[PDB]
Amino acid sequence: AGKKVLIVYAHQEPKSFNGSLKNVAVDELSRQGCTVTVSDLYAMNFEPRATDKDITGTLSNPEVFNYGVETHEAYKQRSLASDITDEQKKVREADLVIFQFPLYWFSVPAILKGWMDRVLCQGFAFDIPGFYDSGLLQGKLALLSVTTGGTAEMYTKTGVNGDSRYFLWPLQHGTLHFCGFKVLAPQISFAPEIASEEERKGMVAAWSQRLQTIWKEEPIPCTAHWHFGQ
Amino acid sequence: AGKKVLIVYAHQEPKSFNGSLKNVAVDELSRQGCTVTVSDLYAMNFEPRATDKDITGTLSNPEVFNYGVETHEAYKQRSLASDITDEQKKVREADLVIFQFPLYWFSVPAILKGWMDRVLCQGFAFDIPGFYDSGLLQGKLALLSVTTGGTAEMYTKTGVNGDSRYFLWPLQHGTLHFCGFKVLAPQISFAPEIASEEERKGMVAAWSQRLQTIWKEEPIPCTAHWHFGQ
Ligand SMILES: Cc1cc2nc3c(=O)[nH]c(=O)nc-3n(C[C@H](O)[C@H](O)[C@H](O)COP(=O)(O)OP(=O)(O)OC[C@H]3O[C@@H](n4cnc5c(N)ncnc54)[C@H](O)[C@@H]3O)c2cc1C
Ligand SMILES: Cc1cc2nc3c(=O)[nH]c(=O)nc-3n(C[C@H](O)[C@H](O)[C@H](O)COP(=O)(O)OP(=O)(O)OC[C@H]3O[C@@H](n4cnc5c(N)ncnc54)[C@H](O)[C@@H]3O)c2cc1C
Ligand SMILES: COc1cc(OC)c2c(c1)c(C)cc(=O)n2C
Ligand SMILES: COc1cc(OC)c2c(c1)c(C)cc(=O)n2C
Ligand SMILES: [Zn+2]
Ligand SMILES: [Zn+2]
């Protein structure tokens, strides 16, 4: 406060561990006096497909469809579909975007992948130039709050899954850094379903505590070295 | 000769460079006498979202929906939605699965992510235990055939994007090897929008040429070292 937060939330069940994490984030950020908005993608039936329906009116080139060029032209000419533009208005206003999701195949669920693909379009989130340190959402913070089915030990460099930082790369680097975000340290809640009824409260109460001082945090160095190195 | 190939194809435009790559694969593998099937996800309006619509029977826990528990039970009972079981039959029959797509945010387009999320369910593609070298699709081969906006140089260890292998990890390892596939070396067709008409022709031809001998190939060692070094 005075800060705005967008929580993009991708879980089907409000009673889930993910739902609890989204709800404590709203509760704690609302208590601090921050402005809070939640894009509840499943409840919204959010469209994940990148298709020519994302441009309204008439196309730059209706013989050969190029999603990147069409949506770039459409963002410049204010003719993107209203579900996209609604989400761009949220992100444009936000000082922090928190993604809350269960890890699906070492990445985001498809409905959230579709939000990244369709809302983070050229002209809005990035351009030539304006990417990585210079991306168009520069100034803004982003944070992945991810839950996993695999344990922390599975997610080490010599573990069956590799270090968590390895799967973070396309999300933190290739997507958030790329668009300009400073990335806060991910919040990774390992294997909640196998944890006890408390312990899970440890993790929820722990995210609420972290959120108390989120605006004091320095963003990680979003480097190949941070992700893979020594 | 006597092999079955599934191509899971994710591009909106038949006239695109991805479209040319898919078509050359069909032409060359058809020429060789292989059995070929293509799942053209956008033309199928393939559903990417993981929702409770994917199970048609009585849920195990209708009070608190857990997509992974409900779909595992649905797969064992034969009560998954038919679009999913349609794709599982194609995968079960295939000896090789080629994924043909443009790189979206260092990953697959969300329509293809939802193919992975919904088709590769517990019981069918993996079980716990029954993953990585014990995954249920053991015996099968997979190959990612990717196109990029970024040049090969941008995709090297000291380029901006980092090495191309780094973005392959959640797909090759976290998804395909997790399900028991052996993974053939990726086909990466760099920056075809930047390339001349000639260089594009050569990249289509280079893919066709590689497919002539694809059944002679051995898979990669799908480890942390192969992807990251050290
Ligand atoms: C398609 C698919 C792909 C996947 N791919 C991967 C992958 O690549 N890698 C991987 O590691 N995992 C993967 N998973 C597993 C997935 O990441 C986990 O199942 C998910 O992260 C668990 O979080 P949840 O909210 O769904 O858990 P929940 O099951 O909702 O949480 C566990 C328990 O906590 C309860 N709970 C709710 N709120 C609270 C609270 N206030 N305090 C205490 N308990 C609470 C729940 O109701 C439940 O009993 C995959 C799953 C699917 C379906
Ligand atoms: C949401 C989104 C996210 C993206 N994220 C990334 C990313 O993370 N990293 C990245 O590097 N890129 C990214 N891109 C760029 C994208 O990967 C490239 O635009 C795409 O890979 C290029 O493939 P295409 O088929 O669309 O090319 P096209 O534009 O179709 O192909 C280039 C040219 O080749 C022509 N062609 C077709 N067939 C032939 C043929 N037989 N012979 C000669 N020429 C032919 C086409 O007609 C066209 O003129 C992103 C794009 C979008 C829209
Ligand atoms: C596809 O669904 C799942 C479910 C899981 O556990 C529930 C998984 C995974 C995938 C992967 C890729 C790694 C892992 O460690 N675990 C535990
Ligand atoms: C998000 O859309 C795009 C479009 C591109 O090029 C057309 C990109 C990228 C993303 C990324 C992340 C890296 C890159 O090198 N290129 C060239
Ligand atoms: Zn980075
Ligand atoms: Zn592997």
From Swiss-Prot, chains A, B:
Keywords: Cytoplasm, FAD, Flavoprotein, Metal-binding, Oxidoreductase, Phosphoprotein, Zinc. Inhibited by melatonin, resveratrol and 5-hydroxytryptamine. One of its GO terms (biological process) is quinone catabolic process. Its main location: cytoplasm. It catalyses: 1-(beta-D-ribofuranosyl)-1,4-dihydronicotinamide + a quinone + H(+) = beta-nicotinamide D-riboside + a quinol. FAD binds at residues 11, 17-20, 103-106, 147-150, 155, 193, 200. Homodimer. The enzyme apparently serves as a quinone reductase in connection with conjugation reactions of hydroquinones involved in detoxification pathways as well as in biosynthetic processes such as the vitamin K-dependent gamma-carboxylation of glutamate residues in prothrombin synthesis. This is Ribosyldihydronicotinamide dehydrogenase [quinone]. It comes from Homo sapiens (Human).
